[PDB]
Amino acid sequence: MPTTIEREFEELDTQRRWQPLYLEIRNESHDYPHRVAKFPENRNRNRYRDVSPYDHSRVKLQNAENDYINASLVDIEEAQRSYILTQGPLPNTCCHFWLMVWQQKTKAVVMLNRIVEKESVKCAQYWPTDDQEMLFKETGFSVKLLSEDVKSYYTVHLLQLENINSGETRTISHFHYTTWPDFGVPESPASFLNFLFKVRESGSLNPDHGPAVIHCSAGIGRSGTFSLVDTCLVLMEKGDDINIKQVLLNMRKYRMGLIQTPDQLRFSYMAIIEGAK
Ligand SMILES: CC(C)CCN[C@@H]1CCc2cc(O)c(N3CC(=O)NS3(=O)=O)c(F)c2C1
């Protein structure tokens, strides 16, 4: 029979209620303090003045003079899942990004943007593209490209993250979705689901590892879409119904503006429907 989410989707589609439902979410999302992001010392650590992590859920850099990073811990207790959603690193925050990855014991970095989108740099080149070692002297980290697996719409880079201070190294999986435009959607629910199931298959979203770092340019539109679909598919496993609107409103309490367009909200519904099959 048509599932409850399938009927909710059919109702929104035939009644053309996507733009009003998105506006409902926007007006029902409560604002939370983000005073630390706005400190004058952190102005050069933010990529967008209107995108800030909340004080109650920001990720702190441990043992640092300035513990600030534009990253949020998004916890979904019910789904047994936590992520770090962050902006695409700036040239001066690449060292903080790698320090965060180490401290949080992250195993995978999920990248949903391209470095250059619509005539603008949306992210720094924070990982090496060749055999040259990329050095982050501020925090004491090295990154070396170990291998690259190129697919039509995504690439997986294996990276060696060296902590020079401790002499330890770790293998990080860098899942780069290369065909998801800024403020746009992936070309199909199947391509997004195949990429999502590749990240899951690696164990990087499990509780035996630290939270996976999900980023696009601002860390809210495409990262929000990816995270909602993944969380809703886990909540779906208990045979219950999910109020997608409420799960998104709950996620928006950890990081502001998750899902930036009504078409990204519609895509989240199609992907959750096809995923649960
Ligand atoms: C929190 C909210 C009120 C701020 C709303 N203004 C900011 C303006 C700058 C900006 C730039 C982006 O590239 C994007 N992305 C769109 C997408 O699909 N993924 S993304 O996060 O990289 C933004 F969402 C925003 C939103």
Numbering used by the authors: 1 to 277
What's written in the study?
PTPN2 and PTPN1 have highly homologous active sites; therefore we designed molecules that optimized interactions in both PTPN2 and PTPN1 through structure-based drug design. We additionally sought interactions proximal to the tetralin ring and designed the isopentyl-amine group to further engage in a hydrogen bond with Asp50 and a hydrophobic interaction with Met256. The combination of optimized properties and ligand–target interactions of AC484 drove low nanomolar enzymatic potency and significantly improved cellular potency (STAT1 IC50 of 176 nM in B16 cells). Additionally, in a biochemical phosphatase screen, AC484 demonstrated high selectivity for PTPN2/N1, with 6–8-fold weaker activity on PTPN9 and no detectable activity on SHP-1 or SHP-2.
The phosphatase PTPN2 (also known as TC-PTP) and its paralogue PTPN1 (also known as PTP-1B) are negative regulators of several cytokine signalling pathways and T cell receptor (TCR) signalling and therefore act as crucial checkpoints of inflammation. PTPN2 and PTPN1 (PTPN2/N1) dampen inflammation by dephosphorylating members of the JAK and STAT families, positioning them as negative regulators of signalling through interferon (IFN), interleukin-2 (IL-2), IL-15 and others. PTPN2 also targets proximal TCR signalling molecules such as FYN and LCK, thereby dampening antigen sensitivity in T cells.
